[PDB]
Design a protein around this ligand. Structure first.
Ligand SMILES: *CCC(=O)N1CN(C(=O)CC*)CN(C(=O)CC*)C1
Lengths: 15, 186
């Protein structure tokens, strides 16, 4: 059960 | 000892009441890991058996403002401690209210023109954040009563994208994101 706000999808942090 | 590495999954910007795992990668065989939060001992993990482990996970089930701030970790082999990891900024988002993002001269500009974003939230503090989608490591911080300005200077197509802003209740406790503003540069 991984939640992520739409605006963080594909964010560079996730690396 | 190699310097440990610290990160947050799925992300370091965690909505209120959502979960986060803080991972600390040390060195295979290390026998004790400590997670520090703002100068205090937050948790310890003692890998047993240690020879199969080079990283430890600290789970936070329900994110809130008391667990938002700077974290770091260290690990031990025998009597020797590593140097600390870099600092992890764990930020809680979706606190309380939603700011308004505006832009001058407007969202459509030509390469060369100066662009300023404006973040307004009357019920927050004087510290605001501007976030370009995709580029959380380049988040800009601005200061203003009621609203803060974010001058981009002369822009190029590198500046094109979707922006959101946050108000703040403390350095690591941020508002809901503004509705997005797309900047179009031709
Ligand atoms: C919690 C889910 C997750 O971290 N990932 C799956 N995924 C999406 O759900 C889209 C938002 C892609 N991921 C990323 O966007 C990493 C930032 C990973």
């Amino acid at each position: 059960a991984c939640y992520x706000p739409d605006y963080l999808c594909x964010d560079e942090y996730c690396a | 000892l190699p310097k440990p590495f610290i990160w947050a999954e799925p992300h370091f910007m965690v909505p209120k009441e959502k979960q986060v795992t803080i991972c600390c990668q040390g060195n295979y065989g290390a026998v004790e890991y400590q997670l520090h939060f703002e100068g205090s001992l937050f948790a310890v993990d003692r890998p047993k058996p240690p020879e199969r482990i080079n990283k430890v996970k600290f789970y936070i089930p329900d994110m809130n403002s008391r667990m938002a701030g700077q974290y770091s970790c260290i690990y031990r082999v025998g009597e020797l401690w590593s140097e600390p990891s870099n600092l992890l900024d764990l930020v809680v988002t979706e606190m309380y209210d939603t700011p308004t993002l505006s832009v001058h001269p407007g969202p459509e500009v030509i390469s060369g023109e100066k662009v300023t974003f404006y973040c307004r939230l009357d019920t927050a503090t004087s510290m605001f954040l501007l976030l370009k989608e995709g580029r959380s490591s380049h988040v800009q911080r601005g200061y203003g009563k009621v609203q803060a300005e974010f001058p981009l200077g002369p822009v190029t197509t590198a500046h094109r994208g979707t922006y959101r802003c946050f108000g703040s209740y403390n350095n690591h406790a941020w508002s809901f994101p503004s509705e997005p503003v797309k900047l179009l540069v031709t």
